[PDB]
């Protein structure tokens, strides 16, 4: 559902636990590299909580495998992203999404 390739290694021991807020910096792109969003651009980290279903499944499973400090490439199948619906005017239907996500800290 979600592939996870490492760009930069993390400390390999600090994995997010449920109810924790992952502070991150991401850049989401469509299969072909087309950027549709990025926190780095806004220069404001992104925070959210795991297991609360706040974010799509690809991220829920994907980020859960990342340790603090790690930066990875997440390739999410439409099943774990926006399905046949996609997101009107932003994400098309059956879109595979690619996110460049860096797990900065846990609070």
């Amino acid at each position: 559902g979600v592939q996870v390739e490492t760009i930069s290694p993390g400390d390999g021991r600090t994995f997010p636990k449920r109810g924790q807020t992952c502070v991150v910096h991401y850049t989401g792109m469509l299969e072909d590299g087309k950027k549709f969003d990025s926190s780095r651009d806004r220069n404001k980290p992104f925070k959210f909580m795991l297991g609360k279903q706040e974010v799509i499944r690809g991220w829920e499973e994907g980020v859960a495998q990342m340790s603090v400090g790690q930066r990875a490439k997440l390739t999410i199948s439409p099943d774990y992203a926006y399905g046949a619906t996609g997101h009107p005017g932003i994400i098309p239907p059956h879109a595979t999404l690619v996110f460049d996500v860096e797990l900065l800290k846990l609070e």
Partner: protein
């Protein structure tokens, strides 16, 4: 009915975002959001409403503007500029 502006908004913005992001229903989002902004228009009559207003008064007003921009342009991007601010207020409120 007695409810603090803080709770009225935390709860409202959550319902609004669910209908739009979760159900793709831009319609139910405005139905929920609308009355909230209208009340603000009426002005604060208590110390807590006033301070809540001094804190997030502007942000909310701008977000409501970005929604109006959307109503006129049909650009899903103007609608998201609003949600960037609603998120912001929502975060601080929790």
């Amino acid at each position: 009915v007695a409810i603090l502006w803080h709770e009225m908004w935390h709860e409202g913005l959550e319902e609004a975002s669910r209908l739009y992001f979760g159900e793709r229903n831009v319609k139910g989002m405005f139905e929920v959001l609308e009355p909230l902004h209208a009340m603000m228009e009426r002005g604060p009559q208590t110390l807590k409403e006033t301070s809540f207003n001094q804190a997030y008064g502007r942000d909310l007003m701008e977000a409501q503007e970005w929604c109006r921009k959307y109503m006129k342009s049909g650009n899903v991007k103007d609608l998201t500029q609003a949600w960037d601010l609603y998120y912001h207020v929502f975060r601080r409120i929790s």
